[PDB]
């Protein structure tokens, strides 16, 4: 089975402990890791951050303390946009004059792929046109990789793409069955299904919806997402099933009532690492001492408040019952956003180095 994980390059800019380069890295953790995130420049793949050719390197040379490993840099991101997306996919020149530079920048940075997050074809401002476009767009980086590896001689290039989990979003622009032939591998992004732009409180990635809930507010639930892919046309062991080492916050109305479904008054306290009101790293939900855990039955996830501050997240036990269930659906594996949240050091949890990601890989492996 695959364990796909992103690495985030402004991880490296957090404070203290929160810091995190590539040397944070663990070489064998995962079997495929993924870069996050290189943008576009005239229709060309380009960097985002002052060291990304060195962050590159080290990156790239953990592969030589174990060469099994499978790196990609990953294109896009929620804050991308759709714009430079949709027109780059526009014409022949434009969609040859990326692929051409993803080629030549894999090879020379020693990438072993490319992975695909366009936030998201089919909306955001993207024509419906766009969802034809990507299929161009996944069809033709596969025909020149293929290609490449035949004259090159090496190992051909990867091609994954990261998806979105909502019905609305996979109608909008995936031509999921073609696509699915010619991506090597497709990271499910099931979680984010509940956050603090709702009005109440609700999981940031639940396995299974409550007894409480029908209709599309159903399907906002892993196992939804999961079958929604599975009988569109993705071979199961393809599927990827992304877990996330983050959670979502919420202020609390009230501290009375602090239930699964509770008024919100909005999205809960930055976290003092993370400084990004709504989300917290696993890490900081840790350092909560004097605060209320508790499970959601229904959705085998689970979640903690102390006061005002209700937070939606996931645990070692939850990540078990998670890799359980791909394993029970024959999915290709588990693919995590991002070692960068985990308890990567081991410096809050007092669980170890990476206790939720290594909590996949042992019961993946
Ligand atoms: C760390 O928070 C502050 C930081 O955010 C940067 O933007 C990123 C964050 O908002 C990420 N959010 C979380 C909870 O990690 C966000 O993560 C998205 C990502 O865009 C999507 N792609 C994938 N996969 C699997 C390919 O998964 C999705 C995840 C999870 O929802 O990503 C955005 C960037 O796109 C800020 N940077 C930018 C460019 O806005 C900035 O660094 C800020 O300080």
């Given at each position: ?8 390059n ?24 993924i870069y996050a995130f290189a943008g576009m420049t005239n229709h060309q793949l380009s960097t985002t951050e002052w060291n990304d050719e060195?962050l590159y390197?080290?990156?790239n ?11 990609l840099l990953a294109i896009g991101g929620?804050n991308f946009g759709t714009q430079k997306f949709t027109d780059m996919v526009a014409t022949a020149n434009n969609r040859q004059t990326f692929v051409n530079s993803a080629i030549r920048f894999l090879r020379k940075y020693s990438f072993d792929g490319l992975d695909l997050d366009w936030e998201?074809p ?8 766009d969802?034809?476009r990507f299929?161009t767009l996944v069809q033709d980086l596969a025909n020149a990789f293929?290609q490449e590896?035949?004259?090159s001689?090496?190992?051909?290039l990867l091609l994954?793409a ?204």
């Amino acid at each position: 089975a695959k364990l796909v994980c992103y690495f985030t390059n402004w991880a490296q800019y957090r404070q203290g402990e929160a810091r995190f380069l590539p040397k944070d890295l663990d070489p064998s953790l995962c079997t495929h890791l993924i870069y996050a995130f290189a943008g576009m420049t005239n229709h060309q793949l380009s960097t985002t951050e002052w060291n990304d050719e060195t962050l590159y390197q080290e990156f790239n040379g953990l592969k030589k303390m174990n060469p099994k490993l499978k790196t990609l840099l990953a294109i896009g991101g929620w804050n991308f946009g759709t714009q430079k997306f949709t027109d780059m996919v526009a014409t022949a020149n434009n969609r040859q004059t990326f692929v051409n530079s993803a080629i030549r920048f894999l090879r020379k940075y020693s990438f072993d792929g490319l992975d695909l997050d366009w936030e998201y074809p089919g909306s955001q401002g993207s024509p419906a046109v766009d969802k034809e476009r990507f299929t161009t767009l996944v069809q033709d980086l596969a025909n020149a990789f293929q290609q490449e590896a035949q004259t090159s001689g090496k190992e051909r290039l990867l091609l994954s793409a990261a998806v979105p989990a909502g019905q609305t979003y996979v109608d909008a622009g995936y031509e999921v069955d073609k696509i699915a032939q010619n991506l090597d591998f497709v990271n499910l992004m099931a979680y984010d299904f509940h956050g603090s732009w709702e009005k109440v409180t609700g999981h940031n990635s639940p396995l299974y919806k409550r007894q409480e809930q029908s209709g599309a507010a159903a399907s906002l639930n892993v196992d939804a997402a999961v079958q929604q892919w599975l009988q569109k046309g993705t071979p199961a062991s393809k599927l990827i099933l992304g877990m996330p080492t983050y959670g979502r916050s919420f202020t609390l109305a009230s501290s009375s009532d602090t239930r699964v479904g509770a008024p919100a008054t909005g999205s809960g306290t930055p976290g003092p690492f993370t400084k990004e009101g709504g989300m917290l790293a696993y890490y900081e939900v840790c350092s909560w001492k004097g605060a209320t855990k508790q499970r959601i039955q229904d959705q085998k996830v689970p979640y903690i408040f102390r006061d005002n501050q209700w937070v939606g997240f996931d645990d070692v036990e939850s990540f078990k019952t998670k890799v359980s269930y791909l394993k029970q659906k024959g999915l290709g594996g588990a693919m995590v956003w991002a070692l960068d949240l985990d308890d990567f050091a081991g410096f809050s949890c007092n669980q170890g180095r990476y206790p939720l990601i290594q909590t996949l890989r042992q019961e993946l492996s």
